[PDB]
Write a protein that binds this ligand. Structure first.
Ligand SMILES: CC(=O)O[C@H]1C[C@@]2(C)[C@@H](C[C@@H](O)[C@H]3[C@@]4(C)CC[C@@H](O)[C@@H](C)[C@@H]4CC[C@@]32C)/C1=C(\CCC=C1CCCC1)C(=O)O
Ligand SMILES: Nc1nc2c(ncn2[C@@H]2O[C@H](COP(=O)(O)OP(=O)(O)O)[C@@H](O)[C@H]2O)c(=O)[nH]1
Ligand SMILES: [Mg+2]
Ligand SMILES: [Mg+2]
Ligand SMILES: [Mg+2]
Ligand SMILES: [Mg+2]
Ligand SMILES: [Mg+2]
Ligand SMILES: [Mg+2]
Length: 116
RNA sequence: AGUACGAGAGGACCGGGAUGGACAUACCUCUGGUGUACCAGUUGUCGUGCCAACGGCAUAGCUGGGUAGCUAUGUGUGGAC
């Protein structure tokens, strides 16, 4: 009938980072918070945050699996680049950053592992 | 401590615990073995005059169990600090 969320409230985002940076943990926490008033599977997951629809795609970090990053950045609108606090930008962080730049995807950086 | 290291794959030193193999030793409470003067079942035959009950011989006649002792495959202990 009528779409439950308008175009102005849609966010198609991908979580990308170097290996072990915390993409899966971040996605799990995001899903938990959006679902409270968690198994991560499938290409994309749909959730709601503050009246906004959020499609999340969690990407792999290894350079061996750059296909997933490519095929996700192709269809995504925004990206969250996760950085390990102790090491900052790492080689696969650079690789995913260049892929996002090639696809012209806006990015927000998130420094995870501040407690480490 | 998935820490140091490592692009990644992977992946520690040092330290702290648990639990084994093999070996040694003591020991029989347990699990089992043996257990020829323990209990019981049973065949053939000869006896105790006969019935009943018993004895001899047949590998301890054979068979099912089995005390102590002696025992391992069983139970403790050791090579720690
Ligand atoms: C985000 C996510 O879920 O990544 C998953 C999904 C993932 C990207 C996977 C790695 C790999 O198997 C991938 C390939 C390319 C494998 C070949 C084909 O089967 C294709 C169709 C297949 C597509 C995707 C797939 C299944 C993931 C992954 C990495 C696993 C980590 C390892 C560390 C050493 C051992 C491996 C992860 O957990 O990050
Ligand atoms: N100390 C700490 N560990 C984290 C944090 N986020 C994730 N981790 C852990 O670091 C590892 C990161 O792996 P994962 O989240 O799967 O990351 P991915 O490789 O980017 O998908 C896992 O062992 C997590 O438990 C964080 O903020 N702090
Ligand atoms: Mg992951
Ligand atoms: Mg004994
Ligand atoms: Mg005894
Ligand atoms: Mg005679
Ligand atoms: Mg008679
Ligand atoms: Mg004779």
């Amino acid at each position: 009938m009528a779409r439950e969320f308008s175009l102005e409230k849609t966010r198609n985002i991908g979580i990308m980072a170097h290996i072990d940076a915390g993409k899966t943990t971040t996605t799990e926490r995001i899903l938990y918070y959006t679902g409270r008033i968690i198994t991560i599977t499938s290409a994309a997951t749909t959730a709601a945050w503050e009246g906004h629809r959020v499609n999340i795609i969690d990407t792999p970090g290894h350079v061996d699996f750059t296909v997933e990053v490519e095929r996700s950045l192709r269809v995504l609108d925004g990206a969250v680049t996760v950085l390990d606090a102790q090491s900052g930008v790492e080689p696969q962080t650079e690789t995913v950053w260049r892929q996002a730049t090639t696809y012209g995807v806006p990015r927000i950086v998130f420094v995870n592992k501040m407690d480490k």
